[PDB]
């Protein structure tokens, strides 16, 4: 029953947003990044991007794809062309809607990039990504063998749960490949099956909504004075701050978010066994930690005198 | 039970009159006014499929 | 938390206003002297007297259900033991309250 | 910036108190975004500090558990007992060895 | 059996692939156990 899950991001389209670090400078990117969440334990993060996943360029379902917005025309590539990295390369697991799930190492940035023919697209964001160990032994890469604590990692399926984001009317995405000059006037050519609207300032205050017609206007000489917007009544976007909004109550629905933080099981390491030397009312502890290990002691009386210590070197505690 | 709205026609939320593969923007407008609804997920998964 | 942000309301050669919603910690401010850009060129034709409204609010995170901390108050406890009593080779195992 | 900057009354209360020091900032000249500046998650800062649990610090060697909040096996105090024994259980002398 | 991570489907060999990869028209588990009963 995956088609019942995917059917709500069919109402939506990918968009372009402002990314601060692109391949050269500051650009408008089709793969812009809204938020990175890293609160699952063993290295799984969940990116909310400005692209869409698990859908094809039409609206139907293709398996491992990124769907993006390239200056209005929606394009697509396979998922194995898209790579992202924090410090080391991350590994993309799955995608659903505006959301992506990756297995990432710890780092102070996220950079997603894909490669078209001779254009390289990138988007680096200053979003901190952390790695959260489980248990009282602080590893950096999850181990090979040990025991199994309970944990909380981002679930890998796109099951509808009780958490939502809010969708809206896309506003007037302005264009300038529409407006062009005649030999003596200004010419607006809206695309087929799409209505534009034109605001100019060459007479007094001029404004028009045009449909499907190469519609010239007299008294406008230079095309710097006319802005040709674009309109799409269908096809929701996210409530982004990198997009402008429409006029009047703005709201069209809400969608569920995939890959929520669920309870699970995680494998944790097991420290080398301490070597215990006994004496008269005293206990010595030889400790050889492989990776840093909390020692926590307490006494079973009315004053516990608890001791809490991160130990990362070979140490003897009496 | 929960009754959803497109007009003054309180239809059952499991039985919508329209679907997205028929209408591009009327389904989105029907979902627009019915956001404050405890049966919005029922209206949602019914309003996709015919 | 999760700082939610509404899209910027932009009017060309106009002036917006602040309409509140009483969302939690809902800040709103109106900025004048703005010449915004889209991907397809500039957005207004006016140099000055344009207006952009920022609106932000705090809502709780999507993972609030499985990752939250419960603040309680406790007083006047109640002790309860699982005894195993044998009186004259007749044994029971009963939760006694003490 | 500390524990409880979000205060939701229950998990599904739909009315949360929030004091997160949110301040809106002026957008960069030529860009459509909503820039803010707020204090970080006090819940995360509580999780970074977190003086250890009562499972490891409790006096008398208690064993704190979760689903009912309870302690176990705290070796403190003493239980008195009352036995109301019927007279039928008292066997006579000569029906036992001596 | 069941995987340790909740969103995962368990293949024939015990390999846990994501649950949206079951019955997708693409073979991921040994002997196509993601493509047996669809
Ligand atoms: Ca498969």
From Swiss-Prot, chain A:
Membrane topology: Single-pass type I membrane protein
Extracellular topological domain: 1-318
Site entry: Interaction with host receptor LDLRAD3: 44, 93, 153, 155-156, 262
Glycosylation sites: 212, 318
Subcellular locations according to the entry: Virion membrane; Host cell membrane
Modification after translation: Palmitoylated via thioester bonds. These palmitoylations may induce disruption of the C-terminus transmembrane. This would result in the reorientation of E2 C-terminus from lumenal to cytoplasmic side. N-glycosylated.
Subunit structure as annotated in this protein's UniProt entry: Interacts with spike glycoprotein E1. Processing of the precursor of protein E3/E2 into E2 and E3 results in a heterodimer of the spike glycoproteins E2 and E1. Spike at virion surface are constituted of a trimer of E2-E1 heterodimers. Interacts with 6K protein. Interacts with host LDLRAD3 (via domain LDL-receptor class A 1); this interaction mediates viral entry to the host cell. 2 adjacent E2-E1 heterodimers in the trimeric spike interact with host LDLRAD3.
Function summary: Plays a role in viral attachment to target host cell, by binding to the cell receptor LDLRAD3. Synthesized as a p62 precursor which is processed by furin at the cell membrane just before virion budding, giving rise to E2-E1 heterodimer. The p62-E1 heterodimer is stable, whereas E2-E1 is unstable and dissociate at low pH. p62 is processed at the last step, presumably to avoid E1 fusion activation before its final export to cell surface.
Name of the molecule in the record: Spike glycoprotein E2
Shown segment, full-protein numbering: 335 to 652 of 1254
Swiss-Prot record, chain E:
Residue ranges of domain LDL-receptor class A in the record: 2-38
Compartment(s): Cell membrane
Tissues in which the protein is found: Expressed at high levels in brain, lung, skeletal muscle, and pancreas. Expressed at moderate levels in heart, placenta, and kidney but not detected in the liver.
Outcome of swapping residue 24 to G: Loss of infection by Venezuelan equine encephalitis virus
Impact reported for residue 31 to G: Complete loss of interaction with Venezuelan equine encephalitis virus/VEEV spike proteins E1
Disulphide bonds in the chain: 3-16, 11-29, 23-38
Domain of life: Eukaryota
Family: Belongs to the LDLR family.
Subunit: Interacts with APP precursor C-terminus. Interacts directly with ITCH; this interaction promotes ITCH auto-ubiquitination leading to its degradation. Interacts directly with NEDD4; this interaction promotes NEDD4 auto-ubiquitination. Interacts directly with NEDD4L. (Microbial infection) Interacts (via domain LDL-receptor class A 1) with Venezuelan equine encephalitis virus/VEEV spike proteins E1 and E2.
Protein name, UniProt field: Low-density lipoprotein receptor class A domain-containing protein 3
